[PDB]
Structures are given as C-alpha cells and as structure tokens.
Amino acid sequence: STGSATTTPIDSLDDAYITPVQIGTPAQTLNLDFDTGSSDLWVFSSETTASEVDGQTIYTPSKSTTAKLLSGATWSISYGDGSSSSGDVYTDTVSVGGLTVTGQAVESAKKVSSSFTEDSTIDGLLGLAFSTLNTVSPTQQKTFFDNAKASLDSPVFTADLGYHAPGTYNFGFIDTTAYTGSITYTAVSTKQGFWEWTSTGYAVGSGTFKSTSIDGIADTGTTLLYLPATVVSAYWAQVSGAKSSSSVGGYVFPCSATLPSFTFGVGSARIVIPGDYIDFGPISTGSSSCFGGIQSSAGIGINIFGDVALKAAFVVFNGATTPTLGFASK
Numbered sequence: 458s459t460g461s462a463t464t465t466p467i468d469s470l471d472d473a474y475i476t477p478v479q480i481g482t483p484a485q486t487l488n489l490d491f492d493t494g495s496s497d498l499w500v501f502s503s504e505t506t507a508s509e510v511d512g513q514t515i516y517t518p519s520k521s522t523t524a525k526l527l528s529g530a531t532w533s534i535s536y537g538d539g540s541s542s543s544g545d546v547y548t549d550t551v552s553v554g555g556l557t558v559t560g561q562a563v564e565s566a567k568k569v570s571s572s573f574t575e576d577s578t579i580d581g582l583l584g585l586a587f588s589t590l591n592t593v594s595p596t597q598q599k600t601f602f603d604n605a606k607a608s609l610d611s612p613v614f615t616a617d618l619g620y621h622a623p624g625t626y627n628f629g630f631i632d633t634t635a636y637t638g639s640i641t642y643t644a645v646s647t648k649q650g651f652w653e654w655t656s657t658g659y660a661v662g663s664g665t666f667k668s669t670s671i672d673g674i675a676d677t678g679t680t681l682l683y684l685p686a687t688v689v690s691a692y693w694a695q696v697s698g699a700k701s702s703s704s705v706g707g708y709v710f711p712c713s714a715t716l717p718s719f720t721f722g723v724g725s726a727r728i729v730i731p732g733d734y735i736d737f738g739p740i741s742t743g744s745s746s747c748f749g750g751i752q753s754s755a756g757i758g759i760n761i762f763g764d765v766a767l768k769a770a771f772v773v774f775n776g777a778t779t780p781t782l783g784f785a786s787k
C-alpha cells in the first residue's frame with residue numbers, strides 16, 4: 458500500500474504544517490502536525506478540558522463505531538519548547554492520504570498547555586520518530602508509520618515541505634518526480650529515538666564550505682534550524698546589524714536586510730537554504746526587528762534540523778531494518 462497527503466503551512470511564516478487525518482468510523486477529519494521529533498499521535502477531543510479548547514476540531518470517540526478504550530492506558534508528553542499535553546487512549550482506524558491503519562493508538566487529550574490552546578489551526582500531533590519514545594503507559598504504543606510499515610510497498614515515508622506553499626507527505630514510495638538530481642543517503646542513530654544523523658559541514662552565502670561534523674535530528678515538528686553557537690555566529694556575522702537578543706530570545710536582524718543563504722552538507726552533497734527561508738518576520742507587529750530562522754542550539758542539548766532546513770530538500774525517512782535518511786535538492 459501507499460499514502461499521499463498534502464501538508465499546508467498554518468500561517469504566512471511557515472510556523473508549522475498541518476496534514477488532514479481521518480480518524481474513526483464515520484471518518485472525523487482532524488488537521489495534525491506531523492512531527493518526526495516525537496512518537497505520540499494525540500488529538501484534541503471531547504475529553505479535553507473545555508477552557509483549553511479554542512477553535513480546534515475535536516475527536517469524539519463515542520461517535521466512532523470502531524473506537525475502543527485502551528483500558529488503563531494514559532499518556533503525558535513535554536516538548537522542547539515547554540509545551541505539554543496528557544490524557545487517555547483509544548484505539549481506532551486512522552487513515553492518511555488513503556493509507557489506513559486499524560487499531561492505531563489515538564491519544565485523547567484531557568489537558569493541553571496554553572500554546573496548544575492558542576493555536577486554533579493544530580488539532581493534534583502525529584508522531585513519526587521511533588516508537589521507543591512513545592509515552593503511553595503502562596503499554597507503550599507504536600506510531601502510525603510503525604503500524605503501517607509492513608503493509609507499505611517500501612518501508613519509507615518522505616517529507617516535501619513547501620516554502621510559503623503546500624507540500625506533501627508520502628508513505629510507502631519515493632516520488633522520483635519530486636526532486637532534482639540524486640538522493641544522498643546518510644546513516645541514522647536511533648539510540649535517542651530520533652532520526653539522528655551527522656551533517657558534514659556548512660557554508661554561509663557564497664563562502665567556502667567548512668568540513669565539520671554536526672550531529673542533529675531531522676525534526677519536521679520544529680520550525681527553525683538550531684545549530685552550534687559557533688556556526689550560528691558565523692552566519693549572523695554576515696548580516697549587518699544582526700545580534701543575539703536575550704530579551705527577544707535569539708538572533709534578530711534588521712527587517713531591511715537581504716539574508717545570505719546557508720548550505721549544509723549531507724555526505725559529499727550539499728543542500729542550500731535560500732536566505733528568504735531564514736526570515737521569520739517582525740518580532741512584534743510593526744517592528745523593524747525581524748526574527749532569525751537559524752538559532753543556537755546551545756541551551757537544548759541537541760542540534761535540530763527543523764523546517765527551515767528540511768523545506769529546502771526532499772527528505773526520505775527510510776525505516777528499513779537499518780534506518781537511514783535521504784536528502785535531495787528540489
């Protein structure tokens with residue numbers, strides 16, 4: 458089998474992407490944030506504290522003839538940005554772009570943190586990291602991809618995120634029309650449960666490429682590109698007036714600037730992030746200070762190749778027995 462679904466930016470900055478997902482019988486369609494940095498499929502629901510729902514579409518398990526309470530199971534997750542959610546668990550039928558999994562764990566939120574409430578466009582998350590990170594207790598549950606894998610034509614999914622435009626998540630096949638050149642594959646460590654890999658270096662604008670190993674994760678659920686402070690300083694030093702602001706929480710730059718590109722290495726290949734992808738707009742409405750899309754990972758403990766990096770590439774998440782990542786230009 459295969460599946461193919463369009464993913465759409467939630468706003469004009471590409472702060473996140475939402476993909477429609479069918480849950481239950483009859484189908485209830487929710488717009489989920491596909492997150493290769495976590496492993497829980499959770500949704501706003503009829504069980505979510507009413508004061509914490511503000512515009513989201515909710516899953517109502519009592520209206521699904523295929524929903525079954527997963528008795529005794531609970532979940533609780535905290536994300537790198539400080540947000541969190543928790544609740545209980547149902548199993549139900551879940552379909553993405555025509556690909557159906559029966560018996561998928563659908564984690565129903567009883568509580569969500571304020572950042573989720575305040576984002577009316579995101580109805581939940583669909584985790585695509587390794588199932589070893591799934592938070593369901595006492596019986597850990599498998600991701601949608603892990604459940605689908607054996608049925609897929611090939612044990613892969615691909616992320617093709619757009620810049621200020623829709624893109625595509627495919628399951629089970631690699632669309633050879635969706636990229637240019639060849640796909641360069643690179644080794645993955647699953648030891649932390651992430652799609653963790655080592656970039657071979659970087660360049661700023663038209664500058665010379667610096668060969669240096671940068672271990673990080675391919676994370677569709679993170680907006681920005683988080684890299685070591687040395688790399689990030691070298692980038693922003695090429696933008697007149699750019700500075701790290703403790704009050705704002707990262708590098709800012711004059712909105713009048715033209716940003717240089719940023720290149721990262723994948724083996725001997727190179728992915729070029731255009732400068733415009735690094736502009737996240739005014740820090741507050743009407744400000745002439747703009748927020749940068751490349752930020753330091755120093756306070757995080759891991760480098761994160763988030764959407765800013767991934768949207769410059771066609772990305773293959775290869776879930777074969779030895780997983781690997783593939784990157785192509787597009």
Ligand SMILES: CNC1Cc2ccccc2C1
Nearest residue numbers: 490492536537538678679
């Ligand atoms: C670090 N990324 C996590 C945190 C978050 C917040 C809003 C939407 C998605 C996600 C995944």
